A paper describes a structure:
Twisted gastrulation ([name]) is an evolutionarily conserved secreted glycoprotein which controls signaling by Bone Morphogenetic Proteins (BMPs). [name] binds BMPs and their antagonist Chordin to control [name] signaling during embryonic development, kidney regeneration and cancer. [name] is composed of two distinct, disulfide-rich domains. The [name] N-terminal domain occupies the [name] type 1 receptor binding site on BMPs, whereas the C-terminal domain binds to a Chordin family member.
We crystallized and determined the [name] structure at 2.6 Å resolution using a platinum single-wavelength anomalous diffraction experiment. [name] crystallized as a dimer in the asymmetric unit, an arrangement that we observed in two crystal forms. The structure of [name] reveals a modular architecture, comprising an α-helical N-terminal domain (NTD, Cys26–Arg80) connected by an extended 18 Å-long linker to a mixed-α/β C-terminal domain (CTD, Pro87–Phe223). The NTD of [name] folds into a compact bundle of three α-helices locked by 7 disulfides. The CTD of [name] is stabilized by 5 disulfide bonds (VIII–XII) and contains a sheet comprised of 5 antiparallel β-strands which constitute its core.
Residue numbers in the entry:
A (entry chain A), B (entry chain A): 25 to 127, 165 to 225
The structure:
């Protein structure tokens, strides 16, 4: 967790000054701003040692955790509904879930085969979608006009489950 | 707009069949699914010609339009409040706006100097922020525990206005 070699000098200096005596983890941390100021430039790499921030990660972050979301110019809701309601394309998996679950109803389209972001944007634009979310596993999720937000964080598209 | 050389053959073939006779732009487009099926693989690059999708872009998309958003593991709201309420760091610009404006109140932090995404994530994590949004102009916006969503789409951080 703590990087002792980098941080021991300055961290001790703050401790001697008696800063960073307050734990954020339970209750208010009155001293947190003062502790950050005393650490200065080393706060990012040494806040773990004083307990003010989480230890340097013990875990490997899944690629799916990142996603990049953009809102398409000039959405065409009628096209999106027309291509969604009817017998959906096999390459397309269609999910409708109640709107604001991710935080009437929100409908999204999950492309099957994994695709590049630029392709994902083009395909959503051709679909009339209001917005698209591109998972960094490369799964593509067009977002419908109804949806308030960017839709489900889940990588629900078949034939690209990588990251699970 | 329309790519005549690529699309003229197939597009004419659909037109002769009398598909793509319905405009999505005003009113329902009954034929939209049939038109897409007739186009098949060329729908993405030729839907403009039949009017079912917007013409290939006349405009250069600003870099700021893309952003990538991730939610930090183990957020520490007390730290975020402690470092936000008090005399804010000069490198940090602090904006509080009513929650759900982007779609009680949502508070976000806009880093001044433009930074890489990995740095932006580390700095937000040290800040206790629930989530971070990284603009592709490279402006970094940590997102507070209060905020329902990912916060303002605006690139409001000083000393990285590139893309405006
Ligand atoms: Pt700091
Ligand atoms: Pt429902
Ligand atoms: Pt399947
Ligand atoms: Pt799966
Ligand atoms: Pt299609
Ligand atoms: Pt307010
Ligand atoms: Pt400024
Ligand atoms: Pt500006």
């Amino acid at each position: 967790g703590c990087n002792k070699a980098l941080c021991a000098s300055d961290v001790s200096k703050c401790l001697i000054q008696e800063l960073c005596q307050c734990r954020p983890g339970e209750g208010n941390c009155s001293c947190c701003k003062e502790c950050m100021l005393c650490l200065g430039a080393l706060w990012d790499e040494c806040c773990d040692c004083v307990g003010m921030c989480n230890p340097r990660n013990y875990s490997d972050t899944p690629p799916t955790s990142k996603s990049t979301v953009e809102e398409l110019h000039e959405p065409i809701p009628s096209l999106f509904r027309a291509l969604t309601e009817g017998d959906t394309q096999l390459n397309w998996n269609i999910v409708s879930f109640p709107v604001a679950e991710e935080l009437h109803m929100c409908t999204v389209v999950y492309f099957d085969d994994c695709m590049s972001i630029h392709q994902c944007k083009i395909s959503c634009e051709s679909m009339g979608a209001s917005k698209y979310r591109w998972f960094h596993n490369a799964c593509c999720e067009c977002i419908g006009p109804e949806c308030i937000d960017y839709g489900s964080k889940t990588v629900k598209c078949m034939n690209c489950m990588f990251g699970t």
